[model samples]
Target: KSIYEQYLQAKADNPGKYARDLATLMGISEAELTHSRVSHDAKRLKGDARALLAALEAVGEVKAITRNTYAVHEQMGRYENQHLNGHAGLILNPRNLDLRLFLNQWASAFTLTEETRHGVRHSIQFFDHQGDALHKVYVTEQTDMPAWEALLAQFITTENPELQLEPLSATDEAVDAEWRAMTDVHQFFQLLKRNNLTRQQAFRAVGNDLAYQVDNSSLTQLLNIAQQEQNEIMIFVGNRGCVQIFTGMIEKVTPHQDWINVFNQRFTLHLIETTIAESWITRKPTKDGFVTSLELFAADGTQIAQLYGQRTEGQPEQTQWRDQIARLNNK
Candidate 1:
């Protein structure tokens, strides 16, 4: 049987199971399964990544969602302060939905409408060539429906049911002298350029003293402690296309059997605890001082999310954050 057929059979066999779960059972990516589903209401939208993001200004007050395999980030906000730079990058630095979009990998777009128990759900989803989601915008009650429809009309594409996705590859961690010689935190970006490394790769190669592994459960403990101390942290979650950041105190943290979540007024983070195979407490030295971060990674070494104490560029690292990290590390 074809992969699509197997996907359909898996979904039918396990009713109400998440697409990602079913996809894993069948040894496929979630995007492949999602694209395999037959939905007449789904439209293949045009792939002008920058233009599409800029058009979100009209559909104000929507929920922006970005994720990878292990972490999911959601925010309720309007898309404003959009500036398209050249043909390669886009920025959505609104107060609530802060996103840095890299457009080079964005390969496909879709306008999806699905009926659920709650009601009809409408979202514009963008994906990379591997069919992995880059970013998504879901219409909320406050969204301007007329404006959304107009924007949809402006960029709808000829529907193509079959998806052409490249196979996902493992991250490369080949470190060199430059990677090991990394002295300052600010030079991290230069290291990436010199080695063509992913953020996770650069972190892994920077030496254990710089990027040593921490206990996985410490992630949950760290967040809870941060909340108890009313510590503000910067949370970073994203995929190849965009990185969404939330910098503030997370008030409510709820833990479940399979998920750990942060529910705030403006931001929400849903993380699958099972997918968190590794966690790291990394230290980066800079002119200001030592910058610390709590980083989580999947089994394949893909970074799920990163947490850092909130501070301005010139400010020193938060003493409270360091204390919390020490508490979390202690057996």
Candidate 2:
């Protein structure tokens, strides 16, 4: 079937998949579609995507590069939830009918299974190999699901028996250090674990940094606004790039320790730098209380945690809650 017709089938079989299908349909090139299977690190098109396509064509079967077994790709699933052209910019005007046709033809690819936490996923594809293609494997918060061994059954691949994670200390670092001091992408597995612990239906009141402005409001206030607008908000902030953090609350807790433990084991907690340094002399200034902020990444644009705190200048422990009712209020 053509991409349009395949999309129609996907929509009928799973209407929820529309958003992703639409996104994929809209952006894919004829060159990409003709390829047999996707390369695992296909996003690195220059090295992988193009290479895989060439290899597949040259050899009936390319070598199985290293394969990962995880559910990735947070495609735009909900049309209403997506902003089309860009998040904050003008709603894009599709140049032609293909956009509309693609939209209707591919509707189900966007529907995602409800997990403890919800957000846009990145992408997932098999790591097509040229001859025997195994390389370093890494995952990020955008990886919404788990990778399975059977998925790579086609390739002679080995699964990393370990589940890696980020540092608890990474959460302590204030957003004032160099980028190297900041956490890496793989640490998101830990954030995902904590996120799953939060209330399932909670979201920020506004798009953290994407929306351009955040009013002074608590998690409850944001939820109220979302209800009024019948829209969900994205919360992202911090100097360490960007992160999405669940800001709402839950009345009950459906404990899932096993899942949490898996993430905890995969991440490290030592890389995070404290608000300042862990030194005493660095602390000196006024007699006000302090608060400390950390840059945490939950997903592409799902949640954010940009902390702000004050210190007594001398005694680092004697810091005060940095008071700013409208800090991210940066419009």
Among the numbered candidates, top TM-score falls to 1
lDDT of 2 by residue, 1-331 (tens): 7654554454467655423344354454222321212232122222222222222222221111111111111111111122222112111112100011111111010011122135522322221111111121222342222331222222322322211222322231221121123243233333335444321111121122211233323322322333343322222222111111222111221213211110111211111111211111011112332222332223333222332232223444311222222322332
Deviation in Å, model 2, residue 251 alpha carbon: 16
Choose the strongest candidate by lDDT.
1
Off by over 4 Å in 1: 1-12, 22-39, 85-95, 167-186, 192-209
lDDT of 1 by residue, 1-331 (tens): 7767897688689977765678789986656665655355567777678788888888889998888888899988888877666444545553477888777777778887877679999989887877777788998889999999999899886666566777664233445445445556658777777777766767667667667777789888988997888888888997877888888887889987789999988789999988887788877777678788888888887779988888776888899998988886632
Q: Show the lowest summed lDDT stretch of 10 residues, model 1.
A: 170-179
TM match of model 2 to true structure: 0.20
**Residue pairs in collision within model 1:** none
